[PDB]
Design an enzyme around this catalytic site. Sequence first.
Site, PDB file in Angstrom:
ATOM      1  N   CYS A   1       0.818  -1.207   0.000  1.00 19.17           N
ATOM      2  CA  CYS A   1       0.000   0.000   0.000  1.00 19.17           C
ATOM      3  C   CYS A   1       0.858   1.267   0.000  1.00 19.17           C
TER       4      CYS A   1
ATOM      5  N   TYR B   1      -8.925  -4.333 -11.154  1.00 21.90           N
ATOM      6  CA  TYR B   1      -9.056  -2.942 -10.742  1.00 21.90           C
ATOM      7  C   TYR B   1      -7.730  -2.207 -10.921  1.00 21.90           C
TER       8      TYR B   1
ATOM      9  N   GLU C   1      -7.545   1.341 -13.094  1.00 13.84           N
ATOM     10  CA  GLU C   1      -7.128   2.511 -12.336  1.00 13.84           C
ATOM     11  C   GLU C   1      -5.858   3.122 -12.933  1.00 13.84           C
TER      12      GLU C   1
ATOM     13  N   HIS D   1     -28.594  17.945   1.588  1.00 15.11           N
ATOM     14  CA  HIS D   1     -28.858  18.519   0.244  1.00 15.11           C
ATOM     15  C   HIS D   1     -28.190  19.886   0.120  1.00 15.11           C
TER      16      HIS D   1
ATOM     17  N   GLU E   1     -27.479  11.771  -1.007  1.00 13.63           N
ATOM     18  CA  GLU E   1     -28.886  11.888  -0.613  1.00 13.63           C
ATOM     19  C   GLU E   1     -29.868  11.223  -1.583  1.00 13.63           C
TER      20      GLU E   1
HETATM   21  C1  LIG Z   1      -1.492  -1.059  -7.160  1.00 12.76           C
HETATM   22  C2  LIG Z   1      -2.251  -1.484  -5.931  1.00 12.76           C
HETATM   23  C3  LIG Z   1      -3.170  -0.610  -5.360  1.00 12.76           C
HETATM   24  C4  LIG Z   1      -3.880  -0.971  -4.217  1.00 12.76           C
HETATM   25  N1  LIG Z   1      -4.786  -0.064  -3.690  1.00 12.76           N
HETATM   26  C5  LIG Z   1      -5.455  -0.421  -2.620  1.00 12.76           C
HETATM   27  C6  LIG Z   1      -6.404   0.524  -2.069  1.00 12.76           C
HETATM   28  O1  LIG Z   1      -6.637   1.646  -2.519  1.00 12.76           O
HETATM   29  N2  LIG Z   1      -7.060   0.057  -0.921  1.00 12.76           N
HETATM   30  C7  LIG Z   1      -6.869  -1.192  -0.309  1.00 12.76           C
HETATM   31  O2  LIG Z   1      -7.520  -1.481   0.710  1.00 12.76           O
HETATM   32  N3  LIG Z   1      -5.973  -2.069  -0.853  1.00 12.76           N
HETATM   33  C8  LIG Z   1      -5.307  -1.693  -1.945  1.00 12.76           C
HETATM   34  N4  LIG Z   1      -4.418  -2.581  -2.490  1.00 12.76           N
HETATM   35  C9  LIG Z   1      -4.202  -3.862  -1.790  1.00 12.76           C
HETATM   36  C10 LIG Z   1      -3.310  -3.696  -0.555  1.00 12.76           C
HETATM   37  O3  LIG Z   1      -2.009  -3.250  -0.937  1.00 12.76           O
HETATM   38  C11 LIG Z   1      -3.124  -5.034   0.165  1.00 12.76           C
HETATM   39  O4  LIG Z   1      -4.293  -5.470   0.852  1.00 12.76           O
HETATM   40  C12 LIG Z   1      -2.012  -4.937   1.208  1.00 12.76           C
HETATM   41  O5  LIG Z   1      -0.837  -4.363   0.620  1.00 12.76           O
HETATM   42  C13 LIG Z   1      -1.752  -6.258   1.902  1.00 12.76           C
HETATM   43  O6  LIG Z   1      -0.853  -6.028   3.007  1.00 12.76           O
HETATM   44  P1  LIG Z   1      -0.066  -7.208   3.700  1.00 12.76           P
HETATM   45  O7  LIG Z   1       0.238  -6.613   5.080  1.00 12.76           O
HETATM   46  O8  LIG Z   1      -0.871  -8.477   3.545  1.00 12.76           O
HETATM   47  O9  LIG Z   1       1.329  -7.369   2.916  1.00 12.76           O
HETATM   48  P2  LIG Z   1       2.245  -6.336   2.133  1.00 12.76           P
HETATM   49  O10 LIG Z   1       1.697  -4.958   2.261  1.00 12.76           O
HETATM   50  O11 LIG Z   1       2.401  -6.875   0.666  1.00 12.76           O
HETATM   51  O12 LIG Z   1       3.567  -6.338   3.047  1.00 12.76           O
HETATM   52  C14 LIG Z   1       4.329  -7.541   3.283  1.00 12.76           C
HETATM   53  C15 LIG Z   1       5.776  -7.122   3.277  1.00 12.76           C
HETATM   54  O13 LIG Z   1       6.630  -8.241   3.626  1.00 12.76           O
HETATM   55  C16 LIG Z   1       7.705  -8.285   2.712  1.00 12.76           C
HETATM   56  N5  LIG Z   1       8.250  -9.644   2.657  1.00 12.76           N
HETATM   57  C17 LIG Z   1       7.866 -10.683   1.848  1.00 12.76           C
HETATM   58  N6  LIG Z   1       8.559 -11.787   2.027  1.00 12.76           N
HETATM   59  C18 LIG Z   1       9.476 -11.443   3.012  1.00 12.76           C
HETATM   60  C19 LIG Z   1      10.509 -12.163   3.654  1.00 12.76           C
HETATM   61  N7  LIG Z   1      10.805 -13.436   3.387  1.00 12.76           N
HETATM   62  N8  LIG Z   1      11.235 -11.521   4.595  1.00 12.76           N
HETATM   63  C20 LIG Z   1      10.946 -10.248   4.872  1.00 12.76           C
HETATM   64  N9  LIG Z   1      10.002  -9.467   4.339  1.00 12.76           N
HETATM   65  C21 LIG Z   1       9.300 -10.125   3.408  1.00 12.76           C
HETATM   66  C22 LIG Z   1       7.133  -7.752   1.403  1.00 12.76           C
HETATM   67  O14 LIG Z   1       8.174  -7.323   0.532  1.00 12.76           O
HETATM   68  C23 LIG Z   1       6.279  -6.591   1.932  1.00 12.76           C
HETATM   69  O15 LIG Z   1       6.996  -5.371   2.107  1.00 12.76           O
HETATM   70  C24 LIG Z   1      -3.666  -2.238  -3.639  1.00 12.76           C
HETATM   71  C25 LIG Z   1      -2.746  -3.112  -4.208  1.00 12.76           C
HETATM   72  C26 LIG Z   1      -2.037  -2.746  -5.349  1.00 12.76           C
HETATM   73  C27 LIG Z   1      -1.042  -3.706  -5.933  1.00 12.76           C
HETATM   74  C1  LIG Z   2     -29.182  30.986   1.694  1.00 13.09           C
HETATM   75  C2  LIG Z   2     -29.860  29.712   2.123  1.00 13.09           C
HETATM   76  C3  LIG Z   2     -29.232  28.493   1.890  1.00 13.09           C
HETATM   77  C4  LIG Z   2     -29.839  27.296   2.266  1.00 13.09           C
HETATM   78  N1  LIG Z   2     -29.169  26.110   2.012  1.00 13.09           N
HETATM   79  C5  LIG Z   2     -29.747  24.992   2.381  1.00 13.09           C
HETATM   80  C6  LIG Z   2     -29.048  23.751   2.119  1.00 13.09           C
HETATM   81  O1  LIG Z   2     -27.950  23.652   1.571  1.00 13.09           O
HETATM   82  N2  LIG Z   2     -29.750  22.611   2.539  1.00 13.09           N
HETATM   83  C7  LIG Z   2     -31.009  22.597   3.159  1.00 13.09           C
HETATM   84  O2  LIG Z   2     -31.520  21.511   3.483  1.00 13.09           O
HETATM   85  N3  LIG Z   2     -31.643  23.783   3.403  1.00 13.09           N
HETATM   86  C8  LIG Z   2     -31.039  24.910   3.027  1.00 13.09           C
HETATM   87  N4  LIG Z   2     -31.677  26.094   3.283  1.00 13.09           N
HETATM   88  C9  LIG Z   2     -33.023  26.039   3.887  1.00 13.09           C
HETATM   89  C10 LIG Z   2     -34.096  25.659   2.861  1.00 13.09           C
HETATM   90  O3  LIG Z   2     -34.181  26.652   1.839  1.00 13.09           O
HETATM   91  C11 LIG Z   2     -35.476  25.584   3.519  1.00 13.09           C
HETATM   92  O4  LIG Z   2     -35.635  24.450   4.365  1.00 13.09           O
HETATM   93  C12 LIG Z   2     -36.575  25.502   2.462  1.00 13.09           C
HETATM   94  O5  LIG Z   2     -36.393  26.533   1.483  1.00 13.09           O
HETATM   95  C13 LIG Z   2     -37.963  25.489   3.070  1.00 13.09           C
HETATM   96  O6  LIG Z   2     -38.918  25.193   2.030  1.00 13.09           O
HETATM   97  P1  LIG Z   2     -40.460  25.480   2.208  1.00 13.09           P
HETATM   98  O7  LIG Z   2     -41.078  24.514   1.191  1.00 13.09           O
HETATM   99  O8  LIG Z   2     -40.795  25.400   3.679  1.00 13.09           O
HETATM  100  O9  LIG Z   2     -40.725  26.978   1.687  1.00 13.09           O
HETATM  101  P2  LIG Z   2     -40.011  27.874   0.588  1.00 13.09           P
HETATM  102  O10 LIG Z   2     -38.962  27.088  -0.118  1.00 13.09           O
HETATM  103  O11 LIG Z   2     -39.517  29.180   1.306  1.00 13.09           O
HETATM  104  O12 LIG Z   2     -41.191  28.043  -0.489  1.00 13.09           O
HETATM  105  C14 LIG Z   2     -42.453  28.654  -0.148  1.00 13.09           C
HETATM  106  C15 LIG Z   2     -42.856  29.471  -1.347  1.00 13.09           C
HETATM  107  O13 LIG Z   2     -44.177  30.037  -1.157  1.00 13.09           O
HETATM  108  C16 LIG Z   2     -44.139  31.398  -1.528  1.00 13.09           C
HETATM  109  N5  LIG Z   2     -45.219  32.124  -0.856  1.00 13.09           N
HETATM  110  C17 LIG Z   2     -45.199  32.732   0.374  1.00 13.09           C
HETATM  111  N6  LIG Z   2     -46.332  33.317   0.702  1.00 13.09           N
HETATM  112  C18 LIG Z   2     -47.148  33.091  -0.399  1.00 13.09           C
HETATM  113  C19 LIG Z   2     -48.481  33.456  -0.694  1.00 13.09           C
HETATM  114  N7  LIG Z   2     -49.261  34.158   0.131  1.00 13.09           N
HETATM  115  N8  LIG Z   2     -48.993  33.067  -1.882  1.00 13.09           N
HETATM  116  C20 LIG Z   2     -48.224  32.363  -2.714  1.00 13.09           C
HETATM  117  N9  LIG Z   2     -46.961  31.959  -2.550  1.00 13.09           N
HETATM  118  C21 LIG Z   2     -46.476  32.360  -1.368  1.00 13.09           C
HETATM  119  C22 LIG Z   2     -42.726  31.860  -1.191  1.00 13.09           C
HETATM  120  O14 LIG Z   2     -42.398  33.050  -1.899  1.00 13.09           O
HETATM  121  C23 LIG Z   2     -41.920  30.642  -1.663  1.00 13.09           C
HETATM  122  O15 LIG Z   2     -41.588  30.663  -3.050  1.00 13.09           O
HETATM  123  C24 LIG Z   2     -31.098  27.326   2.896  1.00 13.09           C
HETATM  124  C25 LIG Z   2     -31.728  28.544   3.128  1.00 13.09           C
HETATM  125  C26 LIG Z   2     -31.119  29.737   2.748  1.00 13.09           C
HETATM  126  C27 LIG Z   2     -31.828  31.036   3.003  1.00 13.09           C
END
Ligand SMILES: Cc1cc2nc3c(=O)[nH]c(=O)nc-3n(C[C@H](O)[C@H](O)[C@H](O)COP(=O)(O)OP(=O)(O)OC[C@H]3O[C@@H](n4cnc5c(N)ncnc54)[C@H](O)[C@@H]3O)c2cc1C
Ligand SMILES: Cc1cc2nc3c(=O)[nH]c(=O)nc-3n(C[C@H](O)[C@H](O)[C@H](O)COP(=O)(O)OP(=O)(O)OC[C@H]3O[C@@H](n4cnc5c(N)ncnc54)[C@H](O)[C@@H]3O)c2cc1C
Lengths: 588, 588
Positions: free
Chosen positions: A149, A291, A295, A566, A571
């Site tokens: 790794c 993989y 990759e 959201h 989500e």
């Molecule tokens: C390109 C690539 C990408 C990967 N990406 C991921 C990832 O993103 N996520 C993930 O979960 N897994 C990933 N894996 C898998 C991950 O590397 C393995 O699960 C992990 O390396 C296993 O670890 P290990 O401890 O079993 O042995 P190793 O990590 O292989 O370590 C054993 C060590 O012992 C040494 N050794 C061997 N024989 C002897 C000896 N006789 N005396 C002394 N030392 C010795 C070896 O040289 C080695 O350094 C990837 C593998 C590869 C090939």
């Molecule tokens: C800047 C900002 C960022 C936000 N970001 C997030 C976020 O990332 N995630 C999240 O979950 N929430 C976020 N919120 C909160 C989210 O917007 C509110 O939970 C949501 O808008 C509530 O929806 P509502 O259906 O209760 O009413 P509203 O969305 O306010 O809609 C009610 C509508 O009815 C209209 N209305 C009012 N009175 C009347 C009437 N008499 N006649 C007709 N129409 C009318 C209004 O003008 C409006 O268009 C954010 C809020 C703000 C201000």
Amino acid sequence: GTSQWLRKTVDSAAVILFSKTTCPYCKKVKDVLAEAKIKHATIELDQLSNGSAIQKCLASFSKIETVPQMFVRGKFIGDSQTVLKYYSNDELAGIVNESKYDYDLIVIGGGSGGLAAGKEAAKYGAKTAVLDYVEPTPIGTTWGLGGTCVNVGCIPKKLMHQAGLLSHALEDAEHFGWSLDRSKISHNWSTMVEGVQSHIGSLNWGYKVALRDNQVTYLNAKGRLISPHEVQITDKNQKVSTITGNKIILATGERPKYPEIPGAVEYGITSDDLFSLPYFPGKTLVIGASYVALECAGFLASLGGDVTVMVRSILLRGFDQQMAEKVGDYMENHGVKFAKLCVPDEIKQLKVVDTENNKPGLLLVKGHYTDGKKFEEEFETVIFAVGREPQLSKVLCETVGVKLDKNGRVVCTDDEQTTVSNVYAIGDINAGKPQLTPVAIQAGRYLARRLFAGATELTDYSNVATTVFTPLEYGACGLSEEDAIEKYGDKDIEVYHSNFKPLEWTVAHREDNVCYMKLVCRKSDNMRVLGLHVLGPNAGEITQGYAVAIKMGATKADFDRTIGIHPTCSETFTTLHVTKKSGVSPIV
Amino acid sequence: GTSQWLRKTVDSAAVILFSKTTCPYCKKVKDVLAEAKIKHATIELDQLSNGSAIQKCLASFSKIETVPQMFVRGKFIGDSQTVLKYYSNDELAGIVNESKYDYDLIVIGGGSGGLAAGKEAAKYGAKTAVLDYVEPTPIGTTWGLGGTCVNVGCIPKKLMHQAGLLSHALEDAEHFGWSLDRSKISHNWSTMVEGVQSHIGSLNWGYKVALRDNQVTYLNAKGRLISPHEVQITDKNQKVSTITGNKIILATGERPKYPEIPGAVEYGITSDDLFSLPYFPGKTLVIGASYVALECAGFLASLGGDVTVMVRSILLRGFDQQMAEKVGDYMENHGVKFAKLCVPDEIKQLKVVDTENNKPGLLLVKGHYTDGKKFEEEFETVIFAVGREPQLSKVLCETVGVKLDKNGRVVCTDDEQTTVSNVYAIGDINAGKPQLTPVAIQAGRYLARRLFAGATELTDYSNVATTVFTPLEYGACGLSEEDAIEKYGDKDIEVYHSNFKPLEWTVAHREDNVCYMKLVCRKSDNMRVLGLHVLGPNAGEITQGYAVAIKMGATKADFDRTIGIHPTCSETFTTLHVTKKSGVSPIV
Ligand SMILES: Cc1cc2nc3c(=O)[nH]c(=O)nc-3n(C[C@H](O)[C@H](O)[C@H](O)COP(=O)(O)OP(=O)(O)OC[C@H]3O[C@@H](n4cnc5c(N)ncnc54)[C@H](O)[C@@H]3O)c2cc1C
Ligand SMILES: Cc1cc2nc3c(=O)[nH]c(=O)nc-3n(C[C@H](O)[C@H](O)[C@H](O)COP(=O)(O)OP(=O)(O)OC[C@H]3O[C@@H](n4cnc5c(N)ncnc54)[C@H](O)[C@@H]3O)c2cc1C
Ligand SMILES: N#Cc1cccc2c3c([nH]c12)CCCC3
Ligand SMILES: N#Cc1cccc2c3c([nH]c12)CCCC3
């Protein structure tokens, strides 16, 4: 029962003390051991619902019934007054180095789990040594402590992924009001490898420091298990010698495999060479469809490379194949050429690698299609990624008596144990287990704590979440759709699926219907979520949380009643409704 | 019992049919209604474990016991032969438009939940109308169908977030081998607003099309509830008129609030004006410390703005305050100036907005510190973000009899019901509920299905996951640390916490110890996870999955036994161990 557990904890612990938090007399002995820098495990009997039973049962060994009792390597040492007698009279650390072996614990393999195990073991007093050699590649590529790794796996690949996504940061950066010109920037390979290698360097160093500060003897040496308790080591100077250990842990992982054809080993590389390559590979053949293969094809493409993958059979065998197909169709639609149903016959050389100018050689690849047609084309670099395999014969003399399977891997009970009782295996050489770095880490820590601390916790190998870091990322948990039919029958399987589009892709003018996700639940068992799948950005982050709900056995209704965040991609999972059975289209 | 449920389903359904999937005679009547384009809800009695009981109970209304039975708006219509008698004799659609009111359903408010409700209602046959007006801001800003999220909330803010993170894509792009010069690129505000407005446009249009294709009469009109079943509307032409509905849903959300000081309304803007602003605001005062206030300060800074926030009391009141502090310290360390413990007194004008050249005016802000000291400084734009509030008096004549609280919000039972039985409220005017867009959506869909389809499912308002999209993102689930003490006492609370660093930040040379995360569990109740917190990239994706485990009641041990994905940020949660109590440091 309890009866039998405690004879194992006393036998295998290097230094262990039984006690109670509500106790002056336990406290006073802990203080003596902190000061003499003596490390130990500790069981507070007033903290298990088993403690009365044990406190009396302890006497089978100590012929006493009260706290505290100290044992060293199975031998009763004494109560309070006798311990401080051993101490006031200057006799402690000599009994606490009484051992029928040099080390409590010898760990062959200094990689992911192998270091994980060693570190946790020395915590609880076990005199632990750790051994690593890196067999040089055919061209001589070699790296530092840490394993696959750190050095030639998850760490260098994913940073190299990151450099690839930044290619679409700059594309999108334009539509969001930033005044760059994407079409006039170029990627430089050397500068990228240089940093990735700088970070790997700092990992290599940090492990050496870690081991040193826990009292673990690191032994840059190739190690072999000749007898059950005899390990033989050879250094850089080719010096031989034998060391002895109570318990022996096998954690040597794997290494890359080569097709048996003319030219492979000579003129081709693998994963181990690619990550410290000194030149940009250029035109590249990727042979393989694991993989690892897609990759690596992925970031090479994203950094302007001209990339081709040669697919024997299917893409990503063993993953959901709908997601396979979708994964690859993104990559074709974004550059990567696929040679479908195709297989190499031989590599010839046209130019030798020019190691002054940082330039690759050049190759002629000869292969054939399964239908008959030929394959012939030239390439600057050829990367083989056709499988990994252990090489236990180099490590484990067949005479000792550890049962390997047919593949080459070790057979272990569900506590990692080999057919010899004092030996265990973890990591990639455990048979039929997930070959993942955090899986190895999980085994090596829980096993350590049971050998030297009386823990009972096993590692749960089931339902382990995965992600492939292809141009579009795919993250997964559980059975894939096709299997979950093959086990309960089509009638019993309902599937909820949906397209989507990251809010970020809206202004960037990216695609309407590439991202996809699905829940595969079982009708009869309360619609229980059997597997979960997602293709889109940040699949790793998106997946990992759902690994918990599923490990507790979540059903669709749990997804329905939970509320979404959201705007996120994640989500969509809380609001699914269209079923594959229904036939309603999943678009937007 | 069952007894009583079914009299409510028959009474409130516009058109409903009871049946069995295993039935030719139910099938033959469904076919007649698909063809005449008559929409309806349908209960298959062979699919509830209550069906025998109901099938006999049905007769209280129909004096028959067999399937199928069709009711229209509470009235028994007939069995098979009589329905097709009504059809062959050309009498169906006239009885199926028998209604004591114009609409089954009148929804005042065309926003998040308000559209969610209307859409789901017309699915099951209810003659549904939907009403939206956008009260122009003090300067005249006005937008299209969709509500606060679409137009002046989650959608335009988050894209504008995205343009801010792309500012650090380009920074990092350099260290990963890309040949741009971050220090010579500039952001253009108009081009950014132009795209965000293009996407909002396509949302406005898509809702109008959606409503039209479900048979929902959209009524761009201001609506008022005079009697329980009488809604009065006024159009753009100022024409008055009354419409009548069986059930009336109140979903008019909120609008921004202003400090009562000289200059505010005149020379200041809010959230509603900012997102379609025609010029870059320039030097900006942000008064307020809500999430809205820091998020908007955030992207303004990231796009080179000179930004200042004036904090009355604390940052992000009601969130975890450790995370508050950490959130803000990132923003100070990355540009955003904070005027701490400070409060405006008056805004004077130095330059008028110049609406030819796309340039802002200029302002003099006068305020004071709580300790005494003065505050005086000039600013090009002043954004007030000090709270949102409903204005129900404009909408709900106090004479009808709906119980508002002290804030201004409506009092509803846990099925969204107002003190008048035929009226309901959802969204931001529901009292003491989460004010979140997917929460509104969740209420409006589940309520629709119970009025017109016999559903029983309530909305679960507890434990709703949140994320703030500040420069560093903060995502949250459950109680915050301080509350969870105040409810069970310090002794009963254990907390697991840890720093970390995204693998991406390694080559980019970003910070070692800014990212943070914590689990707040309850000792006595099996160490149950009471709240979860994370500060780092992609908090929304990272959080949402853990919203499920928690809704099922996850404990720490569930986290311990589950396996991580690597490298991700989210995988830190599976391996926590350092406790706040222990005092061990959480660094790396
Ligand atoms: C390109 C690539 C990408 C990967 N990406 C991921 C990832 O993103 N996520 C993930 O979960 N897994 C990933 N894996 C898998 C991950 O590397 C393995 O699960 C992990 O390396 C296993 O670890 P290990 O401890 O079993 O042995 P190793 O990590 O292989 O370590 C054993 C060590 O012992 C040494 N050794 C061997 N024989 C002897 C000896 N006789 N005396 C002394 N030392 C010795 C070896 O040289 C080695 O350094 C990837 C593998 C590869 C090939
Ligand atoms: C800047 C900002 C960022 C936000 N970001 C997030 C976020 O990332 N995630 C999240 O979950 N929430 C976020 N919120 C909160 C989210 O917007 C509110 O939970 C949501 O808008 C509530 O929806 P509502 O259906 O209760 O009413 P509203 O969305 O306010 O809609 C009610 C509508 O009815 C209209 N209305 C009012 N009175 C009347 C009437 N008499 N006649 C007709 N129409 C009318 C209004 O003008 C409006 O268009 C954010 C809020 C703000 C201000
Ligand atoms: N294609 C693709 C792809 C894969 C994963 C993440 C991303 C992001 C972008 N493209 C991505 C552009 C900016 C937002 C983050
Ligand atoms: N600071 C910050 C910040 C916040 C959220 C996401 C990101 C990413 C970068 N910086 C981020 C640089 C490239 C990886 C994605």
